[PDB]
């Protein structure tokens, strides 16, 4: 009383350091009660849960009064009087309050006369949106550089191609989030082989 599946097309996305937005598809057009749908959100790093109900006519709600860099878990129910059947759990992070940490586990390997494989890692829960491999010829050539901007955090390594042989490069790796970029650090060293 009353059993009904939850709405697919369920989206939970951050919209600020303190709010996340949840959306879903339009309603079942067969009957309503008054019809309502309810949503539950809980913190992972803390113990705080809030219960909300919003009229069935809508397709989104805006969780509020959250904290930055905190992960939350949400589920939702189609309810009559009411006893709907629960959605699956959705995970999302508020956007960060701080600059993201530098990438770590930086590894430079497989250097040839024109290429080199670089890999790294980044920490979760900082709303990091992209990684950028930047490189330039060592020193006095501080007039031009290449940036590889990887917007897919699922990626952890890239093969740099089209490098000049027997040449020395400084390589930097930044992470970018809503607040800004990695605090700059010392560049890595990379020396390509001569042409064989």
């Amino acid at each position: 009383m009353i059993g009904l599946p939850p709405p697919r097309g369920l989206n939970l996305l951050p919209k600020s350091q303190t709010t996340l937005n949840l959306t879903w598809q339009p309603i079942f057009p067969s009957s309503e009660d008054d019809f309502y749908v309810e949503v539950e959100r809980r913190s992972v790093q803390k113990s705080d849960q809030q219960n909300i109900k919003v009229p069935g006519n809508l397709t989104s709600v805006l969780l509020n009064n959250l904290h930055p860099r905190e992960q939350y878990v949400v589920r939702a129910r189609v309810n009559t009087k009411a006893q709907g059947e629960w959605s699956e759990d959705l995970t999302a992070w508020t956007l960060s309050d701080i600059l993201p940490p530098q990438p770590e586990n930086i590894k430079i390997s497989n250097i040839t006369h024109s290429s080199a494989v670089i890999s790294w890692t980044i920490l979760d829960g900082y709303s990091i949106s992209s990684i950028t491999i930047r490189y330039k010829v060592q020193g006095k050539n501080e007039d031009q550089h290449v940036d590889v901007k990887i917007k897919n955090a699922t990626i952890t390594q890239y093969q740099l191609k089209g490098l000049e042989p027997e040449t020395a490069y400084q390589v930097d790796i930044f992470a970018e989030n809503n607040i800004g970029s990695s605090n700059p650090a010392f560049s890595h060293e990379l020396v390509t082989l001569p042409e064989s």
Partner: antibody
Amino acid sequence: QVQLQQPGAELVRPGASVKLSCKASGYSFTSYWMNWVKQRPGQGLEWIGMIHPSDSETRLNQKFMDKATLTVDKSSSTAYMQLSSPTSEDSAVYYCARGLYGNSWGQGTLVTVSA
Amino acid sequence: DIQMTQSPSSLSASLGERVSLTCRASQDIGISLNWLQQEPDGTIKRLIYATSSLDSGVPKRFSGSRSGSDYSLTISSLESEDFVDYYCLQYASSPYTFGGGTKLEIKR
């Protein structure tokens, strides 16, 4: 300030393996290759191999294939080199040095194999 | 294994003299070479990176250069603290290999 800390000396009994340590501080330990180098007293230098602390991949001078084992301990940011069945030929100073291109060096550990 | 023939193995010079050390590579190594300095107490320090780049904080009188298979460390005007040992090192191919070194001493 980058710092690679190696003990000054180790006495080693012939045949008993020894594990040399190189403690890294002042930088991201898992973001740089670590090299090991051997120097016999009054002699030249010899590259043993290197290891990347991120996943412990190692490349070794085949001359040392059956002599040295490189490992790391991430939690203490220490790199180790173990020498197996040491003989008098293994007495020497062993250095560790950070980065693909050795941009910081430890002070070296003098290993003396003697009964 | 690439061989680095470093000459001379020993060199006597005066304060304020200018001297050059040379390594010759048995095969092509490009710019993949460092110059190292060793103090009498065993301390090792990189002076030149990648054939010609002067490391931060190394006095300007040190410079590195190349010509073909020949690589040279030049000290433009010797200071009392420069009379130590020097090594080159190639890392173009594994295993990396060192020159045999140069011991500088003061001529009197």
